[PDB]
Design a protein around this ligand. Structure first.
Ligand code: 9WS
Ligand code: 9WS
Lengths: 257, 251
């Protein structure tokens, strides 16, 4: 609702791959790049997601309802995932602070929108956080580093958001030294979190203390001791006013081809 | 489905525009913590270049809620020459390309929304000067529509002339009925060096597109696909950095 004929999807090249395979395609009629995910009803689930229209959630353009093939069609995000921006240090040697804070703001906005829905993400990660043409956040929802302990031992999303905040400010991989994901799950269940020091989070970080407190409270062992998305927004909004609108555009231009 | 927005969730309701189709006003959504716009089939239409309908008000009032477009209309950009002394070609060519994309999307719908009245005042500009059509003066009206479909292409050809010229389509003409008379007699906005300078990139291809687009005979007018096929090479002529540079220059 709308139904997209799979034959309308030209040049179906691979993007990412489990839940299904995400592939880039060119719409024959629309003359735009789209993204299509192959699924293994789902039509009812897809319909709930079509009601969700907000500037920071990935727009569902339609559905492929062929018998041999079933899939979800969304917009193609030309700047990939947040994971790619933070970690592809060869492509992105520098990622400006106004843009990093803008992403945090927009994630909190997007998640808070989903939380206020009737009825009200599933599992929030840097790989799900897509970046549009202008590096604006588009969350794409339905790795254990973002999973709160109580989910493997409601306030789930805030735990994920804290890890994403630590990852955005550090550009470090949460549990770098840890190889086996079970060792991560163990340490986390024992109260361990990604390290907070000068090496992980340098002193050059604007509003470092204000950020550290938000991360630390966000990834609290006790779900009840974790802030709301309203409180995050209430904590970021002052830090966002610290920059002029032109600096966000200058930050993005520093990444553009 | 389409969500229902309680009128009380709309804080700081300040006038924006009016507006042949009702009065548009900005507001802040209490829960979402964002600026929205509220005006006193469309929900199915979800495309990058169509203005997104966020929800509907039903408190007995019957208003449409969309996203707030911070950079106003295309009309404002082209004509507010003190505010916008320079509007770079990559951005102009991008606006045109994104209009053709948006209109062509509506044309391919099930059922198509050919029942539109396209004008520069309906073409809204997002935070990054990307187009968002909000299709829900006689200068954009084709002659055959004067007395109660290749309508949109006629409008698009006038919008194209207006984008490339930054001139008002019938400046000399005072009475709008005299516009209707001349147009019915085959007259169109002037195409010369003064209206359309020689510095215009792809001038000849653009002139052909406008001229064919605003043809007296609707059958002699192109498809939006023919526009897209003609613009796509033009837009590859610029680097992605020049579009953002063009936008930053608007400050
Ligand atoms: O994942 C994407 N879309 C998507 C998400 C959930 C379900 C179905 C779909 Cl099609 C997507 C869009 N652009 N893009 C670019 C790089 C990597 C992934 C994507
Ligand atoms: O017209 C707008 N929205 C709209 C369109 C059709 C129906 C209902 C609505 Cl609410 C609109 C949004 N931002 N903005 C800025 C300046 C002028 C007009 C607007």
């Amino acid at each position: 609702l709308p139904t997209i004929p799979y034959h309308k999807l030209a040049d179906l090249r691979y993007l990412s791959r489990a839940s299904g395979t995400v592939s880039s395609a060119r719409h024959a009629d629309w003359r735009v790049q789209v993204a299509v995910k192959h699924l293994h009803d789902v039509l009812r689930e897809a319909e709930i997601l079509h009601k969700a229209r907000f500037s920071y959630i990935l727009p569902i353009l339609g559905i492929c309802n062929e018998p041999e093939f079933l899939g979800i069609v969304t917009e193609y995000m030309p700047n990939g995932s947040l994971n790619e921006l933070l970690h592809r240090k060869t492509e992105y040697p520098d990622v400006a602070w106004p843009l990093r804070f803008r992403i945090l703001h927009e994630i909190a906005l997007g998640v808070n929108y989903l939380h206020n829905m009737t009825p009200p993400h599933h599992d929030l990660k840097t790989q799900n956080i897509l970046l549009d043409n202008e590096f604006h956040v588009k969350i794409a929802d339905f790795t254990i580093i973002y999973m709160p302990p109580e989910n493997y031992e409601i306030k789930h999303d805030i735990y994920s958001y804290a890890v994403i905040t630590w990852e955005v400010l550090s550009r470090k991989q949460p549990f770098e030294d840890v190889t086996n994901p079970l060792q991560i799950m163990y340490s986390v269940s024992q109260g361990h979190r990604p390290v907070i020091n000068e090496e992980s989070l340098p002193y050059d970080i604007p509003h470092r203390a204000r950020m550290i407190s938000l991360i630390e409270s966000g990834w609290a062992q006790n779900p009840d001791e974790r802030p709301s998305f309203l409180k995050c927004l209430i904590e970021l909004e002052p830090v966002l006013r610290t920059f002029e609108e032109i600096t966000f555009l200058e930050a993005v231009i520093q990444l553009k081809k």
